[PDB]
Enzyme design. Structure first.
Site, short mmCIF file in Angstrom:
data_model
loop_
_atom_site.label_atom_id
_atom_site.label_comp_id
_atom_site.label_asym_id
_atom_site.label_seq_id
_atom_site.Cartn_x
_atom_site.Cartn_y
_atom_site.Cartn_z
N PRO C 1 0.47 14.07 -15.07
CA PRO C 1 1.64 14.15 -15.98
C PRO C 1 1.44 13.51 -17.36
CG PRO C 1 2.40 13.77 -13.76
CD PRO C 1 0.92 14.06 -13.66
N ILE C 64 2.81 19.88 -14.08
CA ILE C 64 2.68 21.11 -13.33
C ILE C 64 3.42 20.84 -12.06
CG2 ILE C 64 1.20 22.76 -12.18
CD1 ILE C 64 -1.01 21.69 -14.37
N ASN C 97 13.18 15.28 -22.51
CA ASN C 97 13.01 16.67 -22.22
C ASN C 97 11.93 16.83 -21.14
OD1 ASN C 97 13.45 17.33 -25.71
ND2 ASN C 97 14.80 18.03 -24.08
O1 LIG Z 1 -1.29 17.47 -8.91
C1 LIG Z 1 -1.05 17.40 -10.26
C2 LIG Z 1 -1.90 16.69 -11.12
C3 LIG Z 1 -1.60 16.64 -12.49
C4 LIG Z 1 -0.43 17.24 -12.99
C5 LIG Z 1 -0.14 17.32 -14.44
C6 LIG Z 1 0.31 18.38 -15.11
N1 LIG Z 1 0.34 18.07 -16.43
C7 LIG Z 1 0.72 18.83 -17.49
C8 LIG Z 1 0.64 18.31 -18.74
C9 LIG Z 1 0.16 17.02 -18.88
C10 LIG Z 1 -0.24 16.25 -17.81
C11 LIG Z 1 -0.17 16.78 -16.54
N2 LIG Z 1 -0.46 16.32 -15.32
C12 LIG Z 1 0.36 17.99 -12.12
C13 LIG Z 1 0.08 18.03 -10.76
O2 LIG Z 1 0.92 18.72 -9.94
#
Ligand SMILES: Oc1ccc(-c2cn3ccccc3n2)cc1O
Lengths: 114, 114, 114
Positions: C1, C64, C97
């Site tokens: 994230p 995601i 957001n």
């Molecule tokens: O298992 C996972 C690992 C990483 C992310 C994730 C998605 N992202 C999208 C944008 C930025 C950072 C980011 N981290 C989402 C997941 O479901």
């Protein structure tokens, strides 16, 4: 709603009253109370637009609804107008991205708007 | 199209010519004229990736179309390559968020691209 | 994230460890490994919220999946609590957001997650 302007115009070129003017005009334009309008101006940026560095702005407007074809053209006339008049940025060197946010994806006051 | 890079790398480490190079490389990668490409680089940022303050970058690419599975893999290779080579940022410390914008939701020159 | 905070709070009022707290707390809240979590804090901004220049924050969280009604309420409670506690920003002067990103539209390490 939330409006962000990123620009290469220097800080000193942002006139006093600009954030309040944006707040008021976006309240009028979106039909939402000025208390819910957030604005953010980021001057002195390292940026280019079409390969040159004359004054330019990259902006976004996020709102829960009030986003759409006719409305976005009206917002763009409004916001380009203010950027030309107040920051001396040619409207053809401005991009504004519009985001229709779902209330469940906007956090505020420990919760969301859902 | 619009490309933004936010990074903890200092300003003096951003090579002269970087904005022009991103512009030209994106014009070619997206198939759109350089005149429609906007680029923005934001150095000296307080940021971390994976808890580490080693050099890193958080970026976005917005385009009206030219966004999808294959294309985005190709853009990611291009842009990470550029960030590694010019700013010494390891590709595995880079996030790039891609946005396929509807033309009605992009404002420019007092209207939208609709 | 990926979590970004823009705020008019000065650099000095951002306490040491803030980035690391944000990373660990988001690791737990999202159930995602902390090695993948990016955080970015931008102080000293020129911004207003409801026309006022009292402390405020405009934020985003991208991921995601793991974005939804109940989860976003729990993220907002967490994040607003942190900003109140660490930067003395009233929860009612914060917007966050939330973006549920498609795996094909997130670039990392020369490729994407599709
Ligand atoms: O298992 C996972 C690992 C990483 C992310 C994730 C998605 N992202 C999208 C944008 C930025 C950072 C980011 N981290 C989402 C997941 O479901």
């Amino acid at each position: 709603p939330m409006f962000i302007v990123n620009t290469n115009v220097p800080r000193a070129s942002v006139p006093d009253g600009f954030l309040s003017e944006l707040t008021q005009q976006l309240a009028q334009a979106t039909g939402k109370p000025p208390q819910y309008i957030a604005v953010h101006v980021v001057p002195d940026q390292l940026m280019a637009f079409g390969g040159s560095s004359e004054p330019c702005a990259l902006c976004s407007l996020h709102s829960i609804g009030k986003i759409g074809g006719a409305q976005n053209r009206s917002y763009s006339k409004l916001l380009c107008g203010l950027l030309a008049e107040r920051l001396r940025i040619s409207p053809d060197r401005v991009y504004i991205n519009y985001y229709d946010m779902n209330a469940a994806n906007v956090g505020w006051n420990n919760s969301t708007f859902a």
